[PDB]
Scaffold this active site. Structure first.
Site, mmCIF file in Angstrom:
data_model
loop_
_atom_site.group_PDB
_atom_site.id
_atom_site.type_symbol
_atom_site.label_atom_id
_atom_site.label_comp_id
_atom_site.label_asym_id
_atom_site.label_seq_id
_atom_site.Cartn_x
_atom_site.Cartn_y
_atom_site.Cartn_z
ATOM 1 N N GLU A 62 0.683 -1.220 0.045
ATOM 2 C CA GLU A 62 -0.064 -0.219 -0.026
ATOM 3 C C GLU A 62 0.550 0.893 0.388
ATOM 4 O O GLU A 62 0.727 1.915 -0.645
ATOM 5 C CB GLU A 62 -0.814 0.369 1.381
ATOM 6 C CG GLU A 62 -1.796 1.185 1.444
ATOM 7 C CD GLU A 62 -2.469 1.290 2.740
ATOM 8 O OE1 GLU A 62 -2.027 1.626 3.513
ATOM 9 O OE2 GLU A 62 -3.242 1.479 2.668
ATOM 10 N N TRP A 84 -8.292 -1.876 -0.743
ATOM 11 C CA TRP A 84 -9.380 -0.561 -1.132
ATOM 12 C C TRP A 84 -10.188 -1.299 -1.778
ATOM 13 O O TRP A 84 -10.623 0.280 -2.661
ATOM 14 C CB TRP A 84 -7.839 0.188 -1.767
ATOM 15 C CG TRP A 84 -7.230 0.881 -1.076
ATOM 16 C CD1 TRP A 84 -5.763 0.989 -0.195
ATOM 17 C CD2 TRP A 84 -7.233 2.558 -0.266
ATOM 18 N NE1 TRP A 84 -5.785 2.140 0.334
ATOM 19 C CE2 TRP A 84 -6.911 2.997 -0.021
ATOM 20 C CE3 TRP A 84 -8.717 2.925 -0.951
ATOM 21 C CZ2 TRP A 84 -7.079 4.335 1.008
ATOM 22 C CZ3 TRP A 84 -8.795 4.329 0.081
ATOM 23 C CH2 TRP A 84 -8.234 5.110 1.247
ATOM 24 N N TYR A 110 -4.594 9.923 -0.885
ATOM 25 C CA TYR A 110 -3.731 9.479 -0.658
ATOM 26 C C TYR A 110 -2.315 9.854 -1.391
ATOM 27 O O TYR A 110 -1.641 11.051 -1.215
ATOM 28 C CB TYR A 110 -2.854 8.216 0.173
ATOM 29 C CG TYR A 110 -3.657 8.329 2.363
ATOM 30 C CD1 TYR A 110 -3.054 8.731 2.482
ATOM 31 C CD2 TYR A 110 -5.058 7.607 1.869
ATOM 32 C CE1 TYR A 110 -4.824 8.782 4.246
ATOM 33 C CE2 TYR A 110 -5.630 7.181 3.094
ATOM 34 C CZ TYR A 110 -5.342 8.290 4.186
ATOM 35 O OH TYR A 110 -6.482 7.694 5.579
ATOM 36 N N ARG A 150 12.253 23.548 11.162
ATOM 37 C CA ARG A 150 10.711 22.650 11.825
ATOM 38 C C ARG A 150 9.423 22.965 10.775
ATOM 39 O O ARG A 150 8.527 22.052 11.483
ATOM 40 C CB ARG A 150 10.227 23.548 12.839
ATOM 41 C CG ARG A 150 11.676 24.060 13.885
ATOM 42 C CD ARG A 150 11.551 25.372 14.505
ATOM 43 N NE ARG A 150 12.441 25.555 15.591
ATOM 44 C CZ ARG A 150 12.682 26.054 16.553
ATOM 45 N NH1 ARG A 150 11.265 27.509 16.216
ATOM 46 N NH2 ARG A 150 13.913 26.621 17.025
ATOM 47 N N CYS A 170 -7.757 9.480 6.642
ATOM 48 C CA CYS A 170 -7.860 9.103 8.109
ATOM 49 C C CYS A 170 -6.118 9.629 8.866
ATOM 50 O O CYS A 170 -6.126 9.770 10.023
ATOM 51 C CB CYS A 170 -7.185 7.738 8.457
ATOM 52 S SG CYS A 170 -9.593 6.859 8.456
ATOM 53 N N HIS A 171 -5.116 10.037 8.005
ATOM 54 C CA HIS A 171 -3.820 10.584 8.299
ATOM 55 C C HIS A 171 -3.795 11.632 7.597
ATOM 56 O O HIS A 171 -4.074 12.043 6.071
ATOM 57 C CB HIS A 171 -2.501 9.986 7.506
ATOM 58 C CG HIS A 171 -2.775 8.083 7.651
ATOM 59 N ND1 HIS A 171 -2.464 7.468 5.864
ATOM 60 C CD2 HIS A 171 -3.651 7.467 8.192
ATOM 61 C CE1 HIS A 171 -3.082 6.133 6.228
ATOM 62 N NE2 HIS A 171 -3.119 6.356 7.518
ATOM 63 N N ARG A 190 -6.947 11.560 12.950
ATOM 64 C CA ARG A 190 -8.089 12.021 14.059
ATOM 65 C C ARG A 190 -8.835 10.853 13.999
ATOM 66 O O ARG A 190 -9.456 11.356 14.587
ATOM 67 C CB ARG A 190 -8.492 12.656 11.877
ATOM 68 C CG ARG A 190 -9.247 11.648 10.628
ATOM 69 C CD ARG A 190 -10.629 12.809 9.757
ATOM 70 N NE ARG A 190 -10.844 11.435 8.982
ATOM 71 C CZ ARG A 190 -11.691 10.366 9.263
ATOM 72 N NH1 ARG A 190 -12.206 10.400 10.232
ATOM 73 N NH2 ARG A 190 -11.909 9.364 7.891
ATOM 74 N N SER A 191 -8.574 9.508 13.721
ATOM 75 C CA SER A 191 -9.693 8.478 14.167
ATOM 76 C C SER A 191 -8.482 7.292 13.516
ATOM 77 O O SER A 191 -8.174 6.607 12.669
ATOM 78 C CB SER A 191 -11.286 8.668 12.854
ATOM 79 O OG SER A 191 -11.333 7.100 13.664
ATOM 80 N N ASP A 193 -8.703 2.889 14.609
ATOM 81 C CA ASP A 193 -9.482 1.698 15.066
ATOM 82 C C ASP A 193 -8.167 0.699 16.371
ATOM 83 O O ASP A 193 -7.431 0.127 15.156
ATOM 84 C CB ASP A 193 -10.157 0.553 14.670
ATOM 85 C CG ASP A 193 -10.822 -0.148 15.152
ATOM 86 O OD1 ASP A 193 -10.316 -1.251 16.163
ATOM 87 O OD2 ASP A 193 -11.887 -0.733 14.845
ATOM 88 N N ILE A 232 -12.461 1.633 20.564
ATOM 89 C CA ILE A 232 -12.353 0.250 20.548
ATOM 90 C C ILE A 232 -13.954 -0.498 20.138
ATOM 91 O O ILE A 232 -14.418 0.606 20.557
ATOM 92 C CB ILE A 232 -11.776 -0.520 21.373
ATOM 93 C CG1 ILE A 232 -12.004 -0.485 22.717
ATOM 94 C CG2 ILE A 232 -10.611 0.098 21.801
ATOM 95 C CD1 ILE A 232 -11.824 -0.821 23.544
ATOM 96 N N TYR A 233 -14.391 -0.646 19.013
ATOM 97 C CA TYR A 233 -15.590 -1.271 18.757
ATOM 98 C C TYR A 233 -15.809 -2.275 20.189
ATOM 99 O O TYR A 233 -15.504 -2.745 20.861
ATOM 100 C CB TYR A 233 -15.787 -2.574 17.914
ATOM 101 C CG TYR A 233 -16.482 -0.977 16.112
ATOM 102 C CD1 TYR A 233 -17.062 0.404 16.724
ATOM 103 C CD2 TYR A 233 -14.854 -0.936 16.045
ATOM 104 C CE1 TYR A 233 -17.200 1.147 15.627
ATOM 105 C CE2 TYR A 233 -15.015 0.072 14.598
ATOM 106 C CZ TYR A 233 -15.649 0.858 14.751
ATOM 107 O OH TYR A 233 -16.141 0.923 13.318
#
Length: 283
Positions: A62, A84, A110, A150, A170-171, A190-191, A193, A232-233
């Protein structure tokens, strides 16, 4: 010295004790905490979690797929990584109003954002050469010329291109850091699992740091994992409680078999994971 994967298992623990019930998009319950941080050393080891097996061929293939700038799910599918494909299906695209797109076109995901950022997107087979900002190469350039900088960033979040893609990144972004000839990377997710996707993400940007460190002739430093929404689900609670009891086994090592002078020049055969012995799986 404390094992690195303990950081990860420690976050699982924190979510169980201090996490609160929150629903996702489908209404599925999760136990969630907002904001977290974990540090994983890339020095003479690769943080590939041993308490549950991680999908490495998926990570490696990936990432190479991102570097090629490919938005085509089929190109990744042909390598054996199907993750995907669901988002690139003929049915799923039509539901989003993308019906004029051929199967496999994910939009400006991405890959597009990394090399071609800012460019006008049309379709997966178009030639974007010279269009938009190349973040991946500017990163490698800046690390070579101005390591104390920086300002080194690769940002996949583009409010303009959001409605055009299957699912938003997600990234969000990642920052690189250089001191005493060590290359470090912090990711903002951002999120994630914790039981399914997070181990995969740690492997990706650890590998990316390894790759860029190779090109720039630097030694891998720390990898910092920052999570916006850590959850976590509720269906994973007990099986995770079992995984917590497991003792993490020593991280494997990652070998670059040959010398590569260009990020685009990397091939899947150039990478070797040695000494990886994860615990058995669980149902």
């Amino acid at each position: 010295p404390p094992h690195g994967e303990l950081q990860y298992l420690g976050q699982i623990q924190h979510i169980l004790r201090c996490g609160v019930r929150k629903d996702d998009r489908t209404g599925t319950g999760t136990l969630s905490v907002f904001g977290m941080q974990a540090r994983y050393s890339l020095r003479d080891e690769f943080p590939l979690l041993t308490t549950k097996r991680v999908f490495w061929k998926g990570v490696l293939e990936e990432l190479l797929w991102f570097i090629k700038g490919s938005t085509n799910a089929k190109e990744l599918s042909s390598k054996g990584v199907k993750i995907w494909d669901a988002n690139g299906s003929r049915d799923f695209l039509d539901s989003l109003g993308f019906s004029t797109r051929e199967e496999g076109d994910l939009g400006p995901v991405y890959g597009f954002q990394w090399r071609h950022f800012g460019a006008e997107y049309r379709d997966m087979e178009s030639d974007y050469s010279g269009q938009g900002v190349d973040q991946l190469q500017r990163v490698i350039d800046t690390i070579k010329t101005n390591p104390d900088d920086r300002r080194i960033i690769m940002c996949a979040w583009n409010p303009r291109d959001l409605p055009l893609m299957a699912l938003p990144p997600c990234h969000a972004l990642c920052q690189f850091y250089v001191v005493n000839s060590e290359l470090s990377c912090q990711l903002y997710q951002r999120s994630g699992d914790m039981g399914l996707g997070v181990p995969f993400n740690i492997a990706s940007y650890a590998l990316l740091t390894y790759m860029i460190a190779h090109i720039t002739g630097l030694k891998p430093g720390d990898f910092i994992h920052t999570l916006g929404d850590a959850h976590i689900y509720l269906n994973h609670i007990e099986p995770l409680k079992i995984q917590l009891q497991r003792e993490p086994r020593p991280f494997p090592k990652l070998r670059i078999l040959r010398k590569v002078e260009k990020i685009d020049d990397f091939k899947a055969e150039d990478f070797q994971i040695e000494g990886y012995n994860p615990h058995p799986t669980i149902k």
